[PDB]
Design a protein around this ligand. Sequence first.
Ligand SMILES: Nc1c(O)cccc1C(=O)NS(=O)(=O)NC[C@H]1O[C@@H](n2cnc3c(N)ncnc32)[C@H](O)[C@@H]1O
Length: 488
Amino acid sequence: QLKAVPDIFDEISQRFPDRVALIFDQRKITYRELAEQCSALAAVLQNNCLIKGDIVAIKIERSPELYIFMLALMKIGAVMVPVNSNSPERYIGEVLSAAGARYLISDDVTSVPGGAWHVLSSRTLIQNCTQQRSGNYPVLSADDPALILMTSPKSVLIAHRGIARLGLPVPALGNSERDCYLQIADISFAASANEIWMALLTGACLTIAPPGLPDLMALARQIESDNVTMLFLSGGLFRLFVEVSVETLHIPDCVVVSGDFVNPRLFSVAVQAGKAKIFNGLGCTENSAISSLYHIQSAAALSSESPVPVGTPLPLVEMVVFNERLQPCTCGEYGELFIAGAGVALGYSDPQLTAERFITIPYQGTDMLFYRTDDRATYDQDRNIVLVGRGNHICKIRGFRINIAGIEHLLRLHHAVEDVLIVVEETPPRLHACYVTQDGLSVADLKNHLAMHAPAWMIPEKFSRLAVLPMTANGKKDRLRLKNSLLE
Ligand SMILES: Nc1c(O)cccc1C(=O)NS(=O)(=O)NC[C@H]1O[C@@H](n2cnc3c(N)ncnc32)[C@H](O)[C@@H]1O
């Protein structure tokens, strides 16, 4: 069985004490300095009557102190709720309510709403970090709660094992203590665990991006300056790198694209641009962090009809596609993706919604707790998991369902289409496909292209062009912002 996060960290801190752990600006912090500040801060937090099981929110910009407060909290057994410091105060009130946070630690204590949560100044708590008060800390299990995250807000509870599994080397990545990670993902977003905890729990180094919104070249110079070897990117951020500076994507050894569907020809240009291993992967909030990886072997693997696979599970993770009954699907057979293993969350805030998504199923001589993704998926001829839909991306046309995300892939296979979103609209229901291209195309060309790969009733009525498709600051297409933008 796994250990707790502070247990793995202390074992790493005494094994690689002189290796680099954090890099901010030009300053570097070793695992020994990080362990001392974490041990001192953990005793200070206990002297504020923060005990095991308490829910403490975190609102600190990208700083060396941000990750010390994380390691400090888990040590005392608290459950942290990270919130983006760039988020508006309306969203903070929702998250603090949905998480039931009893405390809040911040570097800007005034830009927050009032409520039942106590507000503490991280600028003050660091001042009281004496080298005297040593403290004594609880014994934590792998199933003890670690942090709380949100998803579109649903409140999700993550255990220690969900992020402690990242301390295991991934065979497809070949990571070790020699590597270096770039922390650019939002802390309130589960993809930041791929960067924070795969580094601090393996002896590797974590490069801290500037706070706020650094631009693309600010990240490109940093990947080259601090020699990042493991780069986790979102769909939109990966789209920008290929368009602008694709050469910077082959400085690291592995690049992992995750979070959303992406035009397959972006992977084709990315793999041809160098010899860095490019990955498509599945990340899920309810499975704590990154969950699967598919290595795009070459441009000849990029195919039509179906998008790029998400691959095979990470260590201590199990993923399987079930059909209309609980049994694995064959090749091509479409079903829903179920996930089990050390990454599965402890549940939602609603005990009934928890039971409607977490089910214990016997599988291979063992009762295993599965989470339902509501992602329609299938397999390829090599048992690589391939996503095709998401359940709420459907609609009835001529009495029969159609897959929204499936038509989007058939449209992206057109060489002129850069990207496309499709919207279900209300008429006395039809499809509206907003496309992007750089060369004037006719909407009859896109419809004629669709008829070669789709029946006549899987073709939208309206095609419109958007100078750009909206993003969510987490790198994925915002179908919500597009609909509200189409209300013009
Ligand atoms: N990206 C993450 C990460 O790297 C680490 C940890 C967490 C996340 C995260 O995304 N958590 S989340 O916000 O709850 N979203 C979950 C939903 O995203 C969609 N999704 C995810 N990957 C892909 C992909 N390759 N192709 C197409 N669609 C994808 C599916 O529908 C899925 O069910």
